[PDB]
Amino acid sequence: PDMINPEGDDNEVDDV
Amino acid sequence: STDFDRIYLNSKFSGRFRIADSGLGWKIKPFLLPATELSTVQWSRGCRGYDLKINTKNQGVIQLDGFSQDDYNLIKNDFHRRFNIQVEHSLRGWNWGKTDLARNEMVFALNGKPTFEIPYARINNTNLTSKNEVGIEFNIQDEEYQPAGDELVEMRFYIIVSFQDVFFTTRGRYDIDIYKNSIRLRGKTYEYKLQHRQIQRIVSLPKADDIHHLLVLAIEPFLVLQFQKDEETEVQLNLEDEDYEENYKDKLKKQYDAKTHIVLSHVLKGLTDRRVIVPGEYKSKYDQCAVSCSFKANEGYLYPLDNAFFFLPTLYIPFSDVSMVNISRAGQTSTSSRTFDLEVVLRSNRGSTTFANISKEEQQLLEQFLKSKNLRVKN
Amino acid sequence: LPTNIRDLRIHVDWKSQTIILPIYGRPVPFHINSYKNGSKNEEGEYTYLRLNFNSPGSSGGISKKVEELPYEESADNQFVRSITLRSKDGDRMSETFKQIADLKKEATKREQERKALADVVQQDKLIENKTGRTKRLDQIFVRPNPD
């Protein structure tokens, strides 16, 4: 919905 | 005319009113308001206490209250015969306004809408600052708990015997004065009024090093005053030589020179008309009068007496109220230096208080005092 | 009108985001944004409650500053600073004092609305192209839209 980048946005995966 | 016993007037209770052709008679000290003294009527439902709000030329505003909504068709029926005046403040609530000094009121007009009009009869004192800040401090005549209600103390705006230099803990330095039937505490913090009937007990105790004395006044929690041992100054009472004999029941003279804390304690005992509790004659370790102990992460002095033990928050454990006592101690090399503890349990309020950090000699003295007092020590 | 015709106890309303105070039997209205804060003190059996209002020297650290409510409306107007009263005769001052703290959210909403008054210069009135055809495209995406 935001489209930060045309190329791809963050996966939002948790930090190990 | 009409008669009603539920008319409220003046931080007080209700009164009575009487309508007449010549004027209005308001009785709380009867007062008469003539018909030639009224100027304007501000009776409206926009404010609380929907009744007549009349303006008078005798430096007072008749702010009568306690009338029903059906009385506006009745009381104005008494107004169309002679006065023939029709009754029409501020509702914006904004901080913007203008202060105007009237002949007897202080008009707060927020852009043509007057909001406040305080007469000068209830004013007590006024103070001013360098930044044109005006503070009016009043004293509402409170008579009972029920009839006083809510009362104002100070308003701020921007444009017998008395003592001095008294240090109190319940904390600061202020002054106290004794009235005919009250006591006024004044200072930079606040102003307080204390009744003699509200005061219950007064006691005086010394410190461990005997350099300062603590006066504990329990009023129904307890106010503690610390005084120096060098306070030896004379005091005088601003009263008649014959009236003071009847006032204090000839307990003390008008002029007397002694310790100031002892004089204050004697004055409190004379005013309260109750027996005082002297400190006990029991001696602690190294000829001390109290034992230091830790409670609520605070160091305090606990001292026994004839009927109760006082720990200085300030707590009082009575001998009759405490159901049982017990002593706990462990086995170690450091057991002789503040390791034993004493716990007292009371079933009247269902409360247990434990005082730890007691040495061997202090515990032996406490056990000797308990054996002398024949208290129940659980094992 | 108020919750009751009589006002022996201090009643505070939260829907209008304002309060009414009887100044010794004389009611006056005040705004939640016009009031700064409040505090209470207890000494023995005496209780003193103070309510400090928002004004020059109280709302702002430096006097004669720029304030949206007090100073932008009128930079040289008289304002109230604080009031004090006693509620030691009744154990109902806490319920009235909780509503004053509940009105702080409405005061913050009023402050947010006052800061929303900034950037007053806006677009002019727009006339649509009524002179025949208008130029358009298809398949156009727009990024700063709230869609």
Q: What is the CATH number of the domain that holds B19?
A: 2.30.29.30
What span, in angstroms and rounded, lies between the C-alpha atoms of B84 and B35? Answer: 12
What span, in angstroms and rounded, lies between the C-alpha atoms of C40 and B75? Answer: 42
Q: Name the helix (H) or strand (E) containing B260.
A: helix B260-272
Q: Name the helix (H) or strand (E) containing B245.
A: helix B243-247
- Provide the token pair at B282: 């029991």
Phi–psi pair at B20, nearest 5 degrees: -150, 160
Of residues B377, B310, B290, B318, the one with CA closest to residue B342: B377
Beta bridge partners of B311: B302, B315
Beta bridge partners of B27: B16, B30
What span, in angstroms and rounded, lies between the C-alpha atoms of C71 and C73? Answer: 5
Instruction: Kindly identify which residue of chain C lies nearest to residue B51, measuring between CA atoms.
Output: C5
- Provide the token pair at B35: 């018909």
Q: Centre a 10 Å sphere on the Cβ of residue C18 and count the other Cβ atoms it contains.
A: 21
Resolution value, angstrom units: 3.7
Name the burial class of residue B279, with classes exposed (0-12), middle (13-18) and buried (19+) by CB atoms within 10 angstroms of its CB: middle
- Edge-to-edge strand order for the sheet containing B30-34? B3-8, B14-19, B23-27, B30-34
Contact state of C85 with B219 under an 8 Å Cβ cutoff: no
Contact partners, residue B13, CB within 8 Å, separation at least 6: B146, B147
Name the burial class of residue B9, with classes exposed (0-12), middle (13-18) and buried (19+) by CB atoms within 10 angstroms of its CB: buried
Residue type, B295: F
What is the nearest CA distance from B89 to chain C, expressed in angstroms? 8
Own/partner long-range contacts of C10-14 (Cβ < 8 Å, ≥24 apart)? C10/B150, C10/C87, C10/C93, C10/C96, C11/C96, C12/C96, C12/C99, C12/C100, C12/C103, C13/C99, C14/C99, C14/C102, C14/C103, C14/C106
Instruction: Kindly identify which residue of chain C lies nearest to residue B193, measuring between CA atoms.
Output: C46
What span, in angstroms and rounded, lies between the C-alpha atoms of B263 and C25? Answer: 43
Q: Centre a 10 Å sphere on the Cβ of residue C39 and count the other Cβ atoms it contains.
A: 12
Kindly list the distances between the CA atom of residue B104 and the CA atoms of B57, B90, B118, B139, in Å, as whole numbers in the listed order: 10, 20, 8, 18
Instruction: Kindly identify which residue of chain C lies nearest to residue B168, measuring between CA atoms.
Output: C43
Compute the Cα dihedral for B322, B328, B334, B336 and give only its sign. Answer: positive
- Edge-to-edge strand order for the sheet containing B351-358? B351-358, B340-346, B324-328, B377-378
Q: Give B91's contacts in chain C (Cβ within 8 Å).
A: 29
Q: Which of B49, B146, B154 faces C84 most closely, judged by CB atoms?
A: B154
Determination technique for this entry = cryo-EM
Q: Centre a 10 Å sphere on the Cβ of residue B124 and count the other Cβ atoms it contains.
A: 10
Angle at CA of residue C44, ends C41 and C45, nearest 5°: 90
Instruction: Tell me which residue range forms the domain holding B66.
Output: 3-80
What span, in angstroms and rounded, lies between the C-alpha atoms of B273 and B264? Answer: 14
What span, in angstroms and rounded, lies between the C-alpha atoms of B294 and B284? Answer: 17
Q: Which of B50, B90, B194 faces C29 most closely, judged by CB atoms?
A: B90
Chains that touch B (3 or more CB pairs under 8 A): C
Contact state of C24 with B122 under an 8 Å Cβ cutoff: yes
How far is residue B99 CA from its own chain's centroid?
A: 33
Per the rule left: phi > 0, alpha: psi between -120 and 50, beta: everything else, A3 is: left
Contact partners, residue B66, CB within 8 Å, separation at least 6: B4, B6, B7, B8, B9, B14, B49, B51
DSSP labels, B13-71? -EEEEEE-SSEEEEE--EEEEETTTEEEE---SSSSS-S-EEEESSS-EEE-B---GGG
Per the rule left: phi > 0, alpha: psi between -120 and 50, beta: everything else, B257 is: beta
Q: Give B117's contacts in chain C (Cβ within 8 Å).
A: 26
Residues 133-172 on B with a CB inside 8 Å of C are 133, 140, 142, 145-146, 148-159, 170
What span, in angstroms and rounded, lies between the C-alpha atoms of B51 and B68? Answer: 7
What span, in angstroms and rounded, lies between the C-alpha atoms of B187 and B32? Answer: 41
Phi–psi pair at B244, nearest 5 degrees: -75, -25
What span, in angstroms and rounded, lies between the C-alpha atoms of C88 and B228? Answer: 33
B with C: how many residue pairs have Cβ under 8 Å apart? 152
Q: Give B47's contacts in chain C (Cβ within 8 Å).
A: 26-27
Q: Give B149's contacts in chain C (Cβ within 8 Å).
A: 8-9, 89-90
Contact state of B151 with C89 under an 8 Å Cβ cutoff: yes
Q: Centre a 10 Å sphere on the Cβ of residue B325 and count the other Cβ atoms it contains.
A: 18
Phi–psi pair at B262, nearest 5 degrees: -70, -35
What span, in angstroms and rounded, lies between the C-alpha atoms of B343 and B345? Answer: 7
